[PDB]
């Protein structure tokens, strides 16, 4: 019985994903987040081991949930007449990367490096579990302010990872690659890498580089902030127009700009604690 085992707090936000509430697990006071998804609003369905029809999001989160991660954990879920309810881990204190960037502006390279590294580890983890996120962006990342750990959220636009072409997409347009914009086709990994380049530009410049289809298609990158040459190079590499000209995760992580990353806690101590 959903109502008895959780105590609802205030609405955290709402949007394409539905509505997310702060909550608490009554039994042990574990901070949780409670997400409501309307059935009519779910485009993509999957099925479990047992075979009953759930949101793809549930399948995906189950595939990435075992062990530890920079992926937010699914603790439980419930079906209701017209909606599904997902219980998810909630770090405390926490701020999403979008608000963090809004508040602090362009991030120091050292901080952006630590953050970007953790995103990369989390995305490799997903891929390793056969899950493609398809909506990587600052709004979909949480910062545990005490430990300096990033967590990936919102798998609601995700898919099973495959090696063949995708011809459907419902993530964020401004993070989507030119091959999507032009042809409505992309491969999972190289599209993920493009959005990672958008993300990295966002972190080091305080905003995304493209707002328009024309700019995405053109793929010319201009810097408004002082940014090192190695960082600019990594960015322009991730944003190569041809998918096969983009780096693999391995190449990204071996890039000279990615050397000497801080540990999460070091990151929180240097950049996050007051």
């Amino acid at each position: 019985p959903l109502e008895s085992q959780y105590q609802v707090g205030p609405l955290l936000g709402s949007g394409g994903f539905g509505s997310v509430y702060s909550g608490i697990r009554v039994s042990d006071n574990l901070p949780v987040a409670i997400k409501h998804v309307e059935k009519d609003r779910i485009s993509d369905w999957g099925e479990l081991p047992n075979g009953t029809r759930v949101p793809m999001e549930v399948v995906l989160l189950k595939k990435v949930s075992s062990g530890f991660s920079g992926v937010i954990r699914l603790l439980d879920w419930f079906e209701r007449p017209d909606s599904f309810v997902l219980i998810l881990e909630r770090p405390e204190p926490v701020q999403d990367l979008f608000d963090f960037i809004t508040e602090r502006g362009a991030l120091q390279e050292e901080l952006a490096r630590s953050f970007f590294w953790q995103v990369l580890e989390a995305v490799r983890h997903c891929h390793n579990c056969g899950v493609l996120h398809r909506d990587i962006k600052d709004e979909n990342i949480l910062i545990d302010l005490n430990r300096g750990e990033l967590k990936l959220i919102d798998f609601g636009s995700g898919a099973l990872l495959k090696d063949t072409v995708y011809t459907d997409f419902d993530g964020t347009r401004v993070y989507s690659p030119p091959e999507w914009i032009r042809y409505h086709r992309y491969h999972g990994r190289s599209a993920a890498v493009w959005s990672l380049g958008i993300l990295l530009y966002d972190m080091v410049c305080g905003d995304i580089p493209f707002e328009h289809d024309e700019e995405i298609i053109r793929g010319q990158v201009f810097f408004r902030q002082r940014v090192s040459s190695e960082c600019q190079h990594l960015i322009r590499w991730c944003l190569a127009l041809r998918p096969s000209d983009r780096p693999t995760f391995e190449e990204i992580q071996n890039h000279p700009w990615m050397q000497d990353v801080l540990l999460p806690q070091e990151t929180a101590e240097i950049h996050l604690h007051s």
């Binding site: 979008f98 960037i101 809004t102 962006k137 709004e139 964020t172 347009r173 401004v174 993070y175 305080g206 905003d207």
Partner: peptide, 5 residues
């Protein structure tokens, strides 16, 4: 501007 999507 610096905005949500």
């Amino acid at each position: 501007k610096r905005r949500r999507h």
